[PDB]
Write a protein that binds this ligand. Sequence first.
Ligand SMILES: COc1ccc(C2=N[C@@H](c3ccc(Cl)c(Cl)c3)[C@@H](c3ccc(Cl)c(Cl)c3)N2C(=O)N2CCNC(=O)C2)c(OC(C)C)c1
Ligand SMILES: [Cl-]
Ligand SMILES: [Cl-]
Ligand SMILES: [Cl-]
Ligand code: NA
Ligand code: NA
Length: 91
Amino acid sequence: PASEQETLVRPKPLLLKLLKSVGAQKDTYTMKEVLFYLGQYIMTKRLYDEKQQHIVYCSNDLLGDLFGVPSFSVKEHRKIYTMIYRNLVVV
Ligand SMILES: COc1ccc(C2=N[C@@H](c3ccc(Cl)c(Cl)c3)[C@@H](c3ccc(Cl)c(Cl)c3)N2C(=O)N2CCNC(=O)C2)c(OC(C)C)c1
Ligand SMILES: [Cl-]
Ligand SMILES: [Cl-]
Ligand SMILES: [Cl-]
Ligand code: NA
Ligand code: NA
C-alpha cells in the first residue's frame, strides 16, 4: 500500500558521501531517510553547541559546504529543506 506523500531522491556526489558515512549506500533514498541520516551525521560529528543542541555549526565540516551556510537552527525547516533539495534530484 503506497504512501502518496513519499519523495524519492537521488543525491548529488557530496551528499551521497555524507550519507554513506553514516548509513547505507543506495541509488535512491526517501526524503525521510535523508533527513534522518543528516541529523544523525550532525550527532556523530557533534556539529551542535553542547549547551544549545538545537543550533548546528557546520562551517568547519563538509556539511557546511553542502548546505552553503555556517550555522542554522533546527527550527528553520524551510531553509533546511531548501538546502537539501539543492543537493539532490527528485526521481
Ligand atoms: C533540541 O535539539 C534538537 C531538536 C530537533 C532536531 C531535529 N530536527 C529534525 C528536522 C527535520 C526537518 C528539518 Cl527541515 C530540520 Cl532543519 C530538522 C531532525 C533533523 C533532520 C535533519 C537535519 Cl539537517 C537536522 Cl539539523 C535535524 N532532528 C534530529 O535529527 N534529531 C532529533 C530527533 N532525534 C535525533 O536523534 C536527532 C535536532 O537535531 C539535531 C541533529 C541537531 C536537535
Ligand atoms: Cl519521504
Ligand atoms: Cl556535489
Ligand atoms: Cl530561516
Ligand atoms: Na549556541
Ligand atoms: Na530529476
